[PDB]
């Protein structure tokens, strides 16, 4: 593979795809909260369940997207997904109605993002083999910055325009992504062939187990801060710190992953899970804002060291031909626990009156996942076990 040349425009296209998807998903949720306060219901739970469904569909539909990829091609799959997402976002502008919002936003836009996402991960492997980690790190850092830029943009440049035109404005990003998707060019049912490998099966199970409690801090820290030592007026600093540290850590992790040969890359994820679990369990104990600022940096570092490295490990495990199915099923398995977590944290908060127990319980699943990942068989160990069994 070239490991460069034309691969950089593809890197730019993938960065645009991820950034636009996650920025829109984060921005719509923020917009809904303001309108909820401004206007009374005319619903309470469905208002957040619609956003939850839209976010979760991306991961839930990945296994179906993988077969469409393998059959048609990354370019066609991404173009179709972008077109469907554009149609959904444009149609969301219709008169307010919970029933119509459910369909138009959760299903159409969610499935469009699902179809547009996985090909963005699969495509990079066709151009970068010796520098795939660096490519993924660049893509992830760009995605982080782009996603962080969305609310900071609209909250000022919206000019207090009604919610109706925000969807029209946001649809342009999907249109431009549809145009950019043509840059993808090729260079190389329900069979479940991938699950044969013990290493892949254990790795996917461990990641799924960790995902249950992985995302609780990133969702509830900004609201626990407003509830304890709320006197701090600079509470928005933590979000910027997390975003910048996540971008830097994603880039650094992407660069570092290239120097670790073979399946030794899983040790980075093991260390990330251990560190995140310990930090989440500690969060309740910190009583200094200047200290919590320190915890935010480690949260950002762990976020990168976990997210950025998944695709290269999939390529290492299952070669280049089965990477699409591997990634699709990994996302499909991850889909449910990450949606289940934060709701359980909120239920615990309602029950107990504070987030201490919520963080204590969120700290465990990451440690369990780290323990599970610590025992992934080695390449020689698999053959030794086969010989001993035969």
């Amino acid at each position, epitope marked *: 593979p070239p490991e460069g040349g034309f691969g950089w425009v593809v890197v730019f296209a993938a960065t645009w795809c991820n950034g636009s998807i996650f920025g829109i998903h984060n921005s719509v949720g923020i917009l809904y909260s303001m309108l909820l306060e401004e206007e009374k219901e005319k619903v309470e739970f469905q208002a957040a369940w619609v956003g939850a469904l839209a976010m979760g569909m991306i991961f839930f539909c990945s296994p179906i997207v993988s077969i469409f990829t393998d059959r048609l091609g990354c370019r066609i799959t991404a173009t179709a997904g972008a077109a469907v997402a554009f149609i959904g976002l444009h149609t969301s502008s219709f008169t307010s109605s919970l029933s119509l919002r459910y369909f138009t936003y959760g299903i159409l836009f969610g499935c469009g993002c699902s179809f547009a996402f996985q090909p963005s991960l699969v495509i990079l492997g066709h151009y970068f083999q010796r520098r795939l980690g660096l490519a993924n790190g660049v893509v992830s850092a760009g995605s982080s910055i782009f996603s962080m830029s969305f609310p900071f943009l609209i909250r000022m440049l919206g000019d207090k325009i009604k919610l109706a035109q925000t969807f029209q404005v946001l649809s342009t990003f999907m249109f431009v992504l549809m145009l950019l998707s043509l840059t993808y060019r090729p260079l190389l049912y329900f069979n479940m062939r991938v699950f044969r490998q013990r290493t892949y099966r254990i790795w996917a199970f461990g990641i799924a187990a960790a995902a249950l409690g992985y995302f609780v801090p990133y969702v509830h820290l900004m609201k626990y801060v407003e509830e304890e030592f709320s006197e701090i007026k600079e509470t928005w600093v933590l979000l910027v710190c997390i975003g910048a540290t996540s971008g830097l850590g994603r880039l650094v992790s992407g660069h570092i992953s290239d120097s670790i040969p073979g399946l030794k890359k899983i040790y980075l994820q093991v260390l990330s899970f251990l560190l995140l679990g310990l930090m989440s369990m500690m969060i309740p104990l910190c009583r200094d804002f200047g200290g919590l600022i320190v915890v935010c940096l480690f949260l950002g570092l762990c976020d990168g060291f976990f997210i950025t490295i998944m695709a290269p490990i999939a390529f290492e495990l299952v070669g280049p031909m089965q990477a699409s199915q591997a990634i699709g099923y990994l996302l499909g398995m991850m889909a449910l626990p990450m949606i289940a977590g934060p709701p359980i944290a909120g239920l615990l908060r309602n029950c107990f009156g504070d987030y201490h127990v919520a963080f204590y319980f969120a700290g465990v699943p990451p440690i369990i996942g780290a323990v599970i990942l610590f025992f992934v068989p*080695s*390449r020689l*160990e698999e*053959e*030794l076990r086969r*010989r*001993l069994t035969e």
Partner: nanobody, 121 residues
């Protein structure tokens, strides 16, 4: 890689025996990326692996020998030691020193001179 020294012994039931040797025809650096193990073949039996040492040092054993025998490796010396404790008549069989290497969608295997181990009362 070449396995040369070989060994063996004879004991009564409930006895013990030990084996240890150094390989040849390979550099220590290359060998450190290769695993070591022992094979078995009693009269009328197929050749199967009984014990081995993995790249990370994890020792693995077959059911027939697991729980009685133990294996150790000296990475720098190119040596692997097999300790056979609580031997029994069924343990009588020929054993061969074995080495394995990892390769792209394939492996490289080596075999050593047969070693004689017998148990008789």
């Amino acid at each position: 890689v070449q396995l040369q020294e070989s060994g063996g012994g004879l004991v009564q039931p409930g006895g013990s025996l030990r084996l240890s040797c150094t390989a040849s025809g390979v550099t220590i650096s290359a060998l450190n990326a290769m695993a070591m193990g022992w094979y078995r073949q009693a009269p009328g039996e197929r050749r199967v692996m009984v014990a081995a040492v993995s790249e990370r040092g994890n020792a693995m054993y077959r059911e027939s020998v697991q729980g009685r025998f133990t294996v150790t490796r000296d990475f720098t010396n190119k040596m692997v030691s097999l300790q056979m404790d609580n031997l029994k008549p069924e343990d009588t069989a020929v054993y061969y020193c074995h080495v394995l290497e990892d390769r792209v969608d394939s492996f490289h295997d080596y075999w050593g001179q047969g070693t004689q181990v017998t148990v008789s009362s």
